[PDB]
Design a protein around this ligand. Sequence first.
Ligand code: FES
Ligand SMILES: [K+]
Ligand SMILES: [K+]
Ligand SMILES: [K+]
Ligand SMILES: [K+]
Ligand SMILES: [K+]
Ligand SMILES: [Mg+2]
Ligand SMILES: [Mg+2]
Ligand SMILES: [Mg+2]
Ligand SMILES: [Mg+2]
Ligand SMILES: [Mg+2]
Ligand SMILES: [Mg+2]
Ligand SMILES: [Mg+2]
Ligand SMILES: [Mg+2]
Ligand SMILES: [Mg+2]
Ligand SMILES: [Mg+2]
Ligand SMILES: [Mg+2]
Ligand SMILES: [Mg+2]
Ligand SMILES: [Mg+2]
Ligand SMILES: [Mg+2]
Ligand SMILES: [Mg+2]
Lengths: 170, 65, 108, 113, 50
Amino acid sequence: PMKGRFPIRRTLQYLGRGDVVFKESVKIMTVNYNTYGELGEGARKFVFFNIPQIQYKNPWVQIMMFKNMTPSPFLRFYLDSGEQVLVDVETKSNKEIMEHIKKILGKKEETLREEELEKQQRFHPGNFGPRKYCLRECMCEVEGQVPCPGLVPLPKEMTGKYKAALKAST
Amino acid sequence: QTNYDVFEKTCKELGVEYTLPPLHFQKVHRRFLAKKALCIRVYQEVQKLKKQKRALKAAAAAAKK
Amino acid sequence: ATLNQMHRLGPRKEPPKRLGPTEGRPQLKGVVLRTFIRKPKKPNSANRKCCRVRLSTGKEAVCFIPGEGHTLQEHHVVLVEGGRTQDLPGVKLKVVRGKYDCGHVQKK
Amino acid sequence: IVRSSVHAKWVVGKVIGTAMIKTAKVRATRLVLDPYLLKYFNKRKTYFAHDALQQCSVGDIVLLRALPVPRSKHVKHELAEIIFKVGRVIDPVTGKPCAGTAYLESPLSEPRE
Amino acid sequence: TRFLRRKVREGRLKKKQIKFEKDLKRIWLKAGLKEAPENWQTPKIYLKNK
RNA sequence: AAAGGUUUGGUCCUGGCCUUAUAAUUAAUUAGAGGUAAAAUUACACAUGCAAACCUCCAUAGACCGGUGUAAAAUCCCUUAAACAUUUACUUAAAAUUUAAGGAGAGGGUAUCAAGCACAUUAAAAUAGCUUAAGACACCUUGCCUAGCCACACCCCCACGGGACUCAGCAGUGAUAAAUAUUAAGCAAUAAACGAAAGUUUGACUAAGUUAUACCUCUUAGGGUUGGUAAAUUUCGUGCCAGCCACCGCGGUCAUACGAU
RNA sequence: ACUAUGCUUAGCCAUAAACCUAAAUAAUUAAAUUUAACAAAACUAUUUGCCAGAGAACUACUAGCCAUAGCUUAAAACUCAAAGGAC
RNA sequence: AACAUAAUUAAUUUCUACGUUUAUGGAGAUAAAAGCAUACUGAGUGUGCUUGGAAU
Ligand code: FES
Ligand SMILES: [K+]
Ligand SMILES: [K+]
Ligand SMILES: [K+]
Ligand SMILES: [K+]
Ligand SMILES: [K+]
Ligand SMILES: [Mg+2]
Ligand SMILES: [Mg+2]
Ligand SMILES: [Mg+2]
Ligand SMILES: [Mg+2]
Ligand SMILES: [Mg+2]
Ligand SMILES: [Mg+2]
Ligand SMILES: [Mg+2]
Ligand SMILES: [Mg+2]
Ligand SMILES: [Mg+2]
Ligand SMILES: [Mg+2]
Ligand SMILES: [Mg+2]
Ligand SMILES: [Mg+2]
Ligand SMILES: [Mg+2]
Ligand SMILES: [Mg+2]
Ligand SMILES: [Mg+2]
């Protein structure tokens, strides 16, 4: 049995379910939440369930969490311009908190698809090379082309050993 | 950490001095206390020599000017 | 251990595999120094033919000579290999039959 | 007005020391994923920051701004803001003094003092 | 063989003191001082002082 | 791992070792040829030959290719700035390639290495600070990041200087090691250098030679094993002897375990 | 028979099967749960400490210590295919 | 240690010479009522403690 409570939180599939990818402006997200209370329950679940997913998609963002420092839970984002975005998450479900932060400071689906396509621009199916980078190492693999001499011996007339002998004979 | 204003009055009235917890624990034994004492003494002497050299160097420059 | 304890310690420490009689080498060449008999641990009762050899590394070791009858003598050259002699305690080397002075058992 | 090279253009941390002149030692923490466990833990870093007015106290949360030119070997940041003062927190949501999970001044009232 | 153990103990502690003294000489010599700090005498910490 | 064998009088638990799979090297025995890939004991010492030229003088090149893993926890990824021993265009802007200063994070061992001893800040030059059990410092070992990258180039970390005075370029030699490719052909192809160019040069490379080290296509048959794990022993000899075992074990005269068959 | 000693007042020693052989906390009694067996019904969550076959070894060495045969900390070579626990 | 010459096309020289590591008694093969800690002697006994002895 995997240790801890809700061990599914420690699986790559769960971490990859996060949908909040912050804009490049976002630099820090401080989380102020209370460990005891009734109006801060959604905030506690957000730290428990969602903060791992947010960090997984935003490795360069500093997430620092503070406990029992204020009467109410809130989120404060620090942007690169110097702006500070305060969010109030009291009486808000963890799902509501995730959707709110996605709207205000989350990249849209269109933007992300463009980056994924751009990332693969230099991979070409026609390119030949190692399996790590390319589909086919050599043109011998293609159908109709001359096969590799190791797999199929070349005709005698196409071999340097044979051609050299004829030149001596001439 | 919660009410600093109350904290200040309480210590002043009750006459209690509060020292903050030290970040790092320091081990203590005869060999350490003796080596740590020399290192402080060696440093101080080196800095005293530097100060004397600076005064002599500046004094010579002042005379030339 | 707790997840915090597993994190602070990381993967379990694995001591490196100890080298054996050949010092992590397929075979070694040694010069015979003496030929003697060793008595197997009881319940085994025999007169096993062994020899002391000075290996190329420079150390001196005892090597069991397999086969029924050997012609080895002092100053001969042999190629020793790994493999412990179970009944003979301390004999972790064996002689290779058919190499250098040592020859194949003489089927008679 | 080119910005710093350092990645940490903005760092939040706690003032763990203030014994240097006009400098505050700040401990920041980030979350790092353990590859074996797939769990996040706290990796903490120490940042020296220029406290021009010596207005920092141990235990208070602060925001640091990366300096354009390193002031010294270790001082590459300045004190942008004191997010939370030690024991003197002011609730961002309501704006009223608080002492833990309680209001020193009720939000219903309007003292304006 | 306790007698030897006491003999080994008293000779081991003497080497332990010389190593302590030498380590202190290395520090000030490296710092650039040519003599130990004024009024300093390496304490004898392994002898029968208690 | 889909597991198996092995503590005992017996059962169960715990717990190690071993077996069955895969590969590399060396060795014993054995083997026809052909196609292909690879080639590897040692940063020990080296006879001999070759590996850098080009070209109307100036220059350019010999700073590359090639080789080895010496050193160093040395690195990875990322940021910023500037260049080049450069190119191409403009007489100024796109690149390739480097250098330096850095840091989100990641990065071998020993804690019987527990303290390091100036490792800090301020900028009137004062303050007493800085790193460290969230592993400093010390020591030890190690090429890693693999379309490739880093480090080294007889030694002295460097190379003014000194000295054990040069093949870690190709091919060879001695010594050493369980470890064994030709002192070979051609610049025809591609790459590099040089030239305005026809062209020239290249132990890079190309085409061969050598070798069951690997795969493919054929064709001869050899090697081992045969108590259990674990597929398979029939007659004799030996008799705790000679021998055999990866583990458990076998042999003291009806040996499925050793030797021949 | 008699002594160190057990007692007292001042200092030191830091060891016990110092064990209820049960770490400390908040749960639950249902999961159609003797989930080995014997102890003390079982099980969950949290935090720290500790363990990684056996002998070598409550050992060697290092370091700390009013201790000087001590105390705490604690290996390697080596050798084996067991050692060990409850019935 | 580091000046100066030149100058009716422009150049010249200077731009020095300590300490620290490695190495040459003990534990293991072939068989040719109890205990823990501790003190004394020799396992005997003393003091405390445990049941992993026993006692209707
Ligand atoms: S791999 Fe393509 S010709 Fe051999
Ligand atoms: K087993
Ligand atoms: K062979
Ligand atoms: K070098
Ligand atoms: K050519
Ligand atoms: K056969
Ligand atoms: Mg061979
Ligand atoms: Mg190269
Ligand atoms: Mg090396
Ligand atoms: Mg050489
Ligand atoms: Mg050199
Ligand atoms: Mg060569
Ligand atoms: Mg050369
Ligand atoms: Mg070979
Ligand atoms: Mg040629
Ligand atoms: Mg040209
Ligand atoms: Mg028979
Ligand atoms: Mg047989
Ligand atoms: Mg008396
Ligand atoms: Mg030791
Ligand atoms: Mg008790």
